Amino acid sequence: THTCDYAGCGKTYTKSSHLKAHLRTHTGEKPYHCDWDGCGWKFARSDELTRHYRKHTGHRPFQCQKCDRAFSRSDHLALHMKRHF
DNA sequence: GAGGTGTGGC
DNA sequence: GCCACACCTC
Ligand SMILES: [Zn+2]
Ligand SMILES: [Zn+2]
Ligand SMILES: [Zn+2]
């Protein structure tokens, strides 16, 4: 399958796209750049940039349907939702 | 909550 | 490659 060949790392992935992303941990490549005025943050993964942009926007797409609380990530909500039952 | 990351449908 | 789920660790 898709093995990392950097300095005997050996980590293996199921898709080449996963391997490509993992290789950035060795190269320091960060292709996803925040465009927020004044911010120069960059990230190795698109979804990391999405998390960063929500720091700028305060956007909380995941509203709990049993109380007022909202969250930036679905896993945060899923954990909270357990406390309603 | 936040960061890091393995994953898979499309 | 995009995107978001899901899990671990702090
Ligand atoms: Zn590697
Ligand atoms: Zn930014
Ligand atoms: Zn709630």
Provide structural commentary:
It is found in: Nucleus; Cytoplasm. It comes from Mus musculus. This is Krueppel-like factor 4. Belongs to the krueppel C2H2-type zinc-finger protein family. The protein has 85 residues and is α+β, with helices and mostly antiparallel strands. It has a domain of 29 residues: 2-Layer Sandwich (Double Stranded RNA Binding Domain). 39% of the residues lie in helices and 14% in strands. The strands form three sheets. It has a two-stranded antiparallel ribbon. The protein is flat. The N and C termini lie far apart (43 Å). The site of one zinc ion has 6 residues, from α2. The structure holds a DNA duplex (10 and 10 nucleotides).
| Bound ligands, named by name, code or SMILES | zinc ion
Described by strand count, sense and barrel closure, the largest sheet is:
2 strands, antiparallel
Helix content: 25-40%
Number of strands: 6
Strand order of the largest sheet: 1-2
Distance between the termini: 43 Å
Structural class: alpha+beta
Task: Tell the overall outline.
Answer: flat
| Helix count, DSSP H or I runs of 4 or more residues | 3
Q: What is the fold named in CATH at topology level of the domain at 1-29?
A: Double Stranded RNA Binding Domain
**Alpha carbon gyration radius:** 18 Å
The CATH first-level class of the domain at 1-29 comes to Alpha Beta
Query: What's the architecture of the domain at 1-29 in CATH terms?
Result: 2-Layer Sandwich
Query: In the CATH hierarchy, what is the superfamily of the domain at 1-29?
Result: Classic Zinc Finger
| SSE sequence, one letter per element | EEHEEHEEH
Oligomeric category: monomer
Strand content: 5-15%
PDB class: transcription/dna
Keywords: klf4, zinc finger, Kruppel-like factors, transcription-DNA complex
Assembly: trimeric
Entry title: mouse Klf4 ZnF1-3 and TpG/CpA sequence DNA complex structure
